[PDB]
Amino acid sequence: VENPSLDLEQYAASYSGLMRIERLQFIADHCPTLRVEALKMALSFVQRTFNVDMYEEIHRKLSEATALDTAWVEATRKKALLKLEKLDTDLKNYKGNSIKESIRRGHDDLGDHYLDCGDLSNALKCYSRARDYCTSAKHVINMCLNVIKVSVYLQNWSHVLSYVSKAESTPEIAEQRGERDSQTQAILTKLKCAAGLAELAARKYKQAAKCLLLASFDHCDFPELLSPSNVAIYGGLCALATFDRQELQRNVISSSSFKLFLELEPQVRDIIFKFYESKYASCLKMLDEMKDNLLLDMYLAPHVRTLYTQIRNRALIQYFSPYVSADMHRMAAAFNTTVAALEDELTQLILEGLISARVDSHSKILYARDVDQRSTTFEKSLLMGKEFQRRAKAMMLRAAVLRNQIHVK
Amino acid sequence: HIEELLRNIRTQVLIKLIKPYTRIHIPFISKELNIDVADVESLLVQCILDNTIHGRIDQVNQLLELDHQKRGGARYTALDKWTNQLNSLNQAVVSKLA
Amino acid sequence: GILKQAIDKMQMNTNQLTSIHADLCQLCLLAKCFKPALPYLDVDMMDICKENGAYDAKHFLCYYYYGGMIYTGLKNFERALYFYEQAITTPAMAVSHIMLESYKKYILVSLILLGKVQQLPKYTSQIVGRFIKPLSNAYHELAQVYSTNNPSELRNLVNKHSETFTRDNNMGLVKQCLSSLYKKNIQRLTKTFLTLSLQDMASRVQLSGPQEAEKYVLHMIEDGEIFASINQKDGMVSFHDNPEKYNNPAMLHNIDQEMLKCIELDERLKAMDQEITVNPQFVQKS
């Protein structure tokens, strides 16, 4: 497994915060023989943002790969302790002052500082206790996006979904007017992206794609939850796997607001367009080429295989939909697969009832068989009648035996 | 926009010509449509997938079987509905006790 | 014969179960002459004689179990399964001896005829769900392995657990389970392949040889479970899925025959309800 087309500089530039550190750790853990440059970048740039435990982790990783920096460790520790003491004294003073706005700002600041330190649970409980001092809906939305960020760091997606829904219901349902023909400060796009990401993480592809589809490019320039490139990749792949032809025509290829996302990544546009216009060889070839780079993403890593399997099954179903009797040599050639593996795939799919077809494996012809309504209805009616008669025969005997009150002794 | 054009006209011609027939040869369509057989198959598969032509394509003999079929068998499905109820009904009747 | 002369001289009606039926079935099973007991078993038995409080459960559970014995030896698996199921669902706040054997033979026969374990009816005593189920583990393991449609691990499993099966003296109904996989995999392949070469299907079902595949297909078509044709000019098994059109007078006659049984059942239920609506114990509870 080797891939030199990967660009770590773009990954570092696109994302920010703890997300870049987590992605670097993921790519180091999953991509061998490319660790030197990624860990060099991590050492060079992640030296900031109060690296304490992850610093030791990456030091151990470098030691395994192969002067000791220890004084800076206690220097940063004592600096963090004195900053914590200043924050504690400040928040006691503001609590004594009893000012809602100042207390809320101090709570947000200390939560951000604890997030920088690495105290995820402490920041979560700080925001939980700061929730009680909410005045306006905009502050609610801001602390809501902050809590969504910390929760997707914590990986509790059900809470994320409930929190997104309650955020949607907070400002009297989108201010009841649309915020004067859509909002310039469109946090709605960010919360919809968060909901789609959470649904994707919860193995709910249809809802995730539906929610992430409704995004606007000009309000997607806030790279603190997702980046436009991976948003486009997720949306395109999920829509390709899940939606049928009608939705693949009305939602993904004809939506003007989403052509920009397609233009961001031309490869996804080529994949979708070639899949739509009955062109499967190139589509599967490009998908197989993409898979290597796709597997390096940190969210979509545990979902690539099922996604690809669903795409392939849908492709087979769509290819056989308009045919009554197909020569499977051309079917195998167009799918970049030999005859034996195609036969195995067809015999596996037929047993599940997705494809109503039979295989004639002498001239290698895939025939389509239509069910006769009369014979099926007659057979099932007779079978049901026989079962009902047997059930009556049993239960009337049971009634007799209950009448005579027979039991073991 | 001449590629979007030159395409609706041929689809309209195909729809108009396909109405009376029920099974034809692909080369016969190729002759009047003035395009190769592969493009004829591409147009036919696109039209079928778009639910504009009610038919199926035969590739081993390059035929186009229409749908001059499906007599009034709705009765049958409704009959099946009885089964899907009545079975369950007796399942509730026997499950009362004895 | 003596017993078959007593049955008609004590029961009020031919459809009237009595304790002497159990003795007749026991003697028939132990005499290895199954045919003479068929007329007294095919007919259904409604109402059971109390015979002055001497008809305990030991004369009702035994009869429906020896009926399963006598039918499972004549390859009439449907009625044997029905009798075993009826024997299972007796109301009993304890564990009996013949109940375990009836459950084991039920779990064997259900695998024999269907491809899965038929779910027991809900009107069953809770004793079977707590005591008898964990006691018979080998048969449940047989069912679990059979559910995978793998004819290789089943041989090892039946070889390993041979001691308990031989102790239960039900040998013969488990080798039938082993042979049932080769009869069910072909039927499963029927739903997918219109025609096959003997080599490919022989490798798929794993009987180790194309020659024996022809023998199995011939046996299947002879016994009528499948509609197949052997074409030896090119090594072919063709699957003709056109059994019936449902338009001949024979189907009408079958429908009429089913109607004349449903009508009799309805008449019997109506008569029983009319009899119930006259009891002096009733009329006062409402």
XYZ file of N, CA, C and O in Angstrom, chain A residues 245 318 322-325 330 365 370 373-374 377 380 384 388 391 395 398-399, chain B residues 45 48-50 56-60 73 76-77 80 83 87 90 94 97-98:
152
model
N -32.633 6.869 -9.056
C -32.430 7.686 -10.249
C -33.149 9.027 -10.151
O -32.592 10.063 -10.533
N -29.165 -1.256 -11.782
C -29.535 -0.293 -12.813
C -29.164 -0.795 -14.201
O -29.913 -0.589 -15.163
N -33.106 -2.193 -17.610
C -33.764 -2.039 -18.916
C -33.606 -3.210 -19.874
O -33.904 -3.044 -21.061
N -33.153 -4.374 -19.419
C -32.892 -5.498 -20.304
C -33.802 -6.670 -19.966
O -34.123 -6.917 -18.801
N -34.215 -7.392 -21.008
C -34.991 -8.607 -20.843
C -34.146 -9.864 -21.033
O -34.481 -10.912 -20.470
N -33.058 -9.788 -21.797
C -32.137 -10.912 -21.943
C -30.801 -10.342 -22.399
O -30.698 -9.823 -23.515
N -20.574 -9.048 -22.459
C -20.493 -7.591 -22.455
C -20.706 -7.036 -21.054
O -20.103 -6.023 -20.682
N -26.114 -16.402 -20.861
C -27.167 -15.421 -21.096
C -27.931 -15.193 -19.799
O -28.370 -16.150 -19.154
N -40.553 -12.897 -15.559
C -41.657 -12.189 -14.927
C -42.598 -13.184 -14.260
O -42.897 -14.245 -14.814
N -49.134 -13.698 -12.010
C -49.938 -13.367 -10.836
C -50.898 -14.493 -10.478
O -51.064 -14.820 -9.297
N -51.537 -15.100 -11.483
C -52.572 -16.095 -11.215
C -52.017 -17.296 -10.459
O -52.574 -17.709 -9.435
N -50.898 -16.366 -6.836
C -52.024 -16.117 -5.943
C -52.756 -17.409 -5.611
O -53.120 -17.639 -4.452
N -50.540 -19.504 -3.151
C -50.468 -18.957 -1.799
C -51.817 -19.037 -1.096
O -51.873 -19.278 0.114
N -52.308 -21.044 2.361
C -52.881 -20.397 3.536
C -54.112 -21.144 4.028
O -54.314 -21.290 5.238
N -54.537 -22.771 7.707
C -55.659 -22.427 8.573
C -56.423 -23.670 9.007
O -56.842 -23.779 10.165
N -54.418 -25.371 11.659
C -54.489 -24.621 12.909
C -55.815 -24.858 13.618
O -55.852 -25.032 14.842
N -56.372 -26.496 17.295
C -56.894 -25.705 18.402
C -58.205 -26.276 18.925
O -58.497 -26.139 20.115
N -57.148 -28.813 21.246
C -56.710 -28.148 22.470
C -57.897 -27.722 23.322
O -57.849 -27.799 24.553
N -58.966 -27.249 22.682
C -60.172 -26.891 23.419
C -60.746 -28.102 24.135
O -61.152 -28.011 25.300
N -31.942 2.906 -23.975
C -31.741 2.630 -22.558
C -31.992 3.885 -21.729
O -32.578 3.813 -20.643
N -35.810 4.310 -21.586
C -36.425 3.324 -20.702
C -36.148 3.665 -19.244
O -37.046 3.598 -18.395
N -34.907 4.047 -18.925
C -34.575 4.418 -17.557
C -35.269 5.702 -17.120
O -35.416 5.930 -15.915
N -35.697 6.539 -18.063
C -36.431 7.755 -17.744
C -37.942 7.547 -17.743
O -38.690 8.525 -17.644
N -38.818 -3.252 -23.057
C -37.536 -3.838 -22.698
C -36.729 -4.110 -23.959
O -37.283 -4.271 -25.050
N -35.409 -4.156 -23.799
C -34.481 -4.328 -24.910
C -33.904 -5.733 -24.858
O -33.426 -6.180 -23.809
N -33.946 -6.430 -25.990
C -33.334 -7.740 -26.142
C -32.006 -7.568 -26.867
O -31.969 -7.062 -27.993
N -30.922 -7.995 -26.220
C -29.578 -7.784 -26.742
C -29.055 -8.950 -27.565
O -28.249 -8.733 -28.477
N -29.483 -10.180 -27.274
C -29.013 -11.320 -28.054
C -29.623 -11.337 -29.451
O -29.037 -11.921 -30.370
N -55.848 -7.574 -14.335
C -55.550 -8.483 -13.253
C -55.512 -7.854 -11.880
O -55.062 -8.505 -10.930
N -56.737 -9.911 -9.005
C -55.827 -10.859 -8.372
C -55.118 -10.238 -7.178
O -55.113 -10.813 -6.084
N -54.548 -9.041 -7.355
C -53.812 -8.437 -6.249
C -54.735 -8.215 -5.059
O -54.394 -8.562 -3.922
N -55.174 -11.363 -3.352
C -54.021 -11.608 -2.495
C -54.160 -10.844 -1.190
O -53.816 -11.358 -0.117
N -55.832 -12.762 1.508
C -54.933 -13.693 2.174
C -54.130 -12.974 3.248
O -54.176 -13.346 4.429
N -55.198 -14.808 6.995
C -54.195 -15.532 7.761
C -53.991 -14.878 9.121
O -54.280 -15.477 10.165
N -56.923 -15.302 11.549
C -57.035 -16.545 12.300
C -55.905 -16.666 13.309
O -56.095 -17.247 14.383
N -56.983 -17.924 16.986
C -56.436 -19.075 17.690
C -55.658 -18.661 18.931
O -55.559 -19.439 19.887
N -57.014 -18.222 23.348
C -56.610 -19.201 24.350
C -56.773 -20.605 23.785
O -55.805 -21.212 23.317
N -57.997 -21.120 23.820
C -58.295 -22.445 23.299
C -59.777 -22.559 22.969
O -60.168 -23.243 22.025
